[PDB]
C-alpha cells in the first residue's frame, strides 16, 4: 500500500493552492487520512484529517484556512489564502484505531513542497571553489540565488561519489537559497552538474585547480 502527494509549487501569497494525496492498496472507508506539514528545520504540525465516514477536523489555528475533502482514491488539501508562514513540506499520512488500540500514522508520503513568496522563480548561479593558486585536491561549487528549493548537485554526472560532501541549503536575507558541495579527487576534468527542475534549468560548471 502506498501514499503519494503532489501539487506543491511556488505560489504568491493569497493564491489558492490545492494539494493532492493519491492512495493505493487500501480503502479510505477503513483508514483515516491526515495532513501534516513541516517547515524547514522545524517540528511536525498536524493540519487536520478526514475520517472514514467523511467527518473532517482541523487544528484550531487551521480552521477557515484549509479545506480537506476526499474521493475513493485521493484526498485533497486546499490552502485558501496562502501566506509566507505556510511555506513547508506537506505530508499525507494514514492512521487507524482498534478497540482501544490507536495504531499511529504508519504510512506517509514523501511530502510535497509548498513555497509561498511574491518573488519570481529563479535558477542558481554556480561558482567554482578551488584552493588559492600532497597530490589529491578538494574542489567545490557554490550554488547561490535560487528559488524555490531544491537543486540537485552531482559531480561528473554522478560518477564521482566518494569524498562528496554537500551541505544543507541556507535561506538568504533576500529570501533566495544557497548551498555548496565539495569533492575530493586525485589530481588527474571535474564538473559539477546543478539541476533546478523548478525553472527547467541545468548548469554544468567545470572546476579548474
Amino acid at each position: 500500500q502506498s501514499v503519494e502527494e503532489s501539487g506543491g509549487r511556488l505560489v504568491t501569497p493569497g493564491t489558492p493552492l490545492t494539494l493532492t494525496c493519491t492512495v493505493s492498496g487500501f480503502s479510505l472507508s477503513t483508514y483515516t487520512m491526515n495532513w501534516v506539514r513541516q517547515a524547514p528545520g522545524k517540528g511536525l504540525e498536524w493540519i487536520g484529517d478526514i475520517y472514514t465516514d467523511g467527518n473532517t477536523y482541523y487544528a484550531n489555528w487551521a480552521k477557515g484556512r484549509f479545506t480537506i475533502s476526499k474521493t475513493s482514491t485521493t484526498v485533497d488539501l486546499k490552502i485558501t489564502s496562502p501566506t509566507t508562514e505556510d511555506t513547508a513540506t506537506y505530508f499525507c499520512a494514514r492512521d487507524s484505531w482498534d478497540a482501544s488500540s490507536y495504531y499511529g500514522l504508519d504510512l506517509w508520503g514523501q511530502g510535497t513542497l509548498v513555497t509561498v513568496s511574491s518573488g519570481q522563480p529563479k535558477g542558481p548561479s554556480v561558482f567554482p571553489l578551488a584552493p588559492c593558486c600532497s597530490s589529491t585536491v578538494t574542489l567545490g561549487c557554490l550554488v547561490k540565488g535560487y528559488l524555490p528549493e531544491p537543486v540537485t548537485v552531482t559531480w561528473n554526472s554522478g560518477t564521482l561519489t566518494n569524498g562528496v560532501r554537500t551541505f544543507p541549503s541556507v535561506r538568504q536575507s533576500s529570501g533566495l537559497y544557497s548551498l555548496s558541495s565539495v569533492v575530493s579527487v586525485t589530481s588527474s576534468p571535474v564538473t559539477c552538474n546543478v539541476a533546478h527542475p523548478a525553472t527547467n534549468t541545468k548548469v554544468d560548471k567545470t572546476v579548474a585547480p
Binding site: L105, T138, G140, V170
Partner: protein, 214 residues
Amino acid sequence: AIKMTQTPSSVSAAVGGTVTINCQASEDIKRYLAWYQQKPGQPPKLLIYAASKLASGVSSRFKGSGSGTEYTLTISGVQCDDAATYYCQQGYTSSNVNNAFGGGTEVVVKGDPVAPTVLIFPPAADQVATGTVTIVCVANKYFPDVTVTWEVDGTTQTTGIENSKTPQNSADCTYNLSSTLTLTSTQYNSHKEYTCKVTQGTTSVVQSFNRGDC
C-alpha cells in the same frame, strides 16, 4: 486545546548509553499515543503505537511507557544510527487540537571523537565581478561540535557570516560544516589576508589565503 508537551528539546548520550524522552498531555489521552523517529529529508517513521507496542520491524531497544497524561520513550544501547528527531503524538482526539504532535526532541549521539579537516576557498573571479563575494570555509568530518572564527587582516568578523551543519552521520556520528563570509567586492578588495579558524575544545585549526596571491 489538547496540548502535547515534549521534553527535553535536545538530549545527548554516549554510544551504548540510554536516552529518555518525556511527553505530557494536557488531558487524559488514555494511551492513544504514538512515537516517531525522523531524519532530515525523510518522512517520520512510526516506532511505537498504543503507547507501548512496537511497530512492525522496530527494534526492542525502543521502549514506550506511561498512561493518563504522562508518557516516556526510552532508547537503550544507543547507536549512531539512532541520531534523529523524535516526536510523540496523541491519537485520542481530532477536536479542539492545536497540535497533535509534541515539539520533538533532537537526540545527539556522542561517538568516537574526530578532529576537523579544514579548507578555505577564495572567491572565484566570476564572483568578484558581480559586486558581492562569498568566501567559503569547510570543516569536514568532525565530532564534537566546533566554533568558527573568521578574521580579516587579524580583525575578527562579526557580520556577514553564515554556518550550515549537516545532520550527524548515521555510521560514525560526525558532522560536516560549511561556513561562509559574504562581503561587497569593494570591502573584499579593502583587505589582504582572509582566515578561517575552527576550534574544537581548546584545539584550533587555521586556514588562510592572501587575496593578492589569488
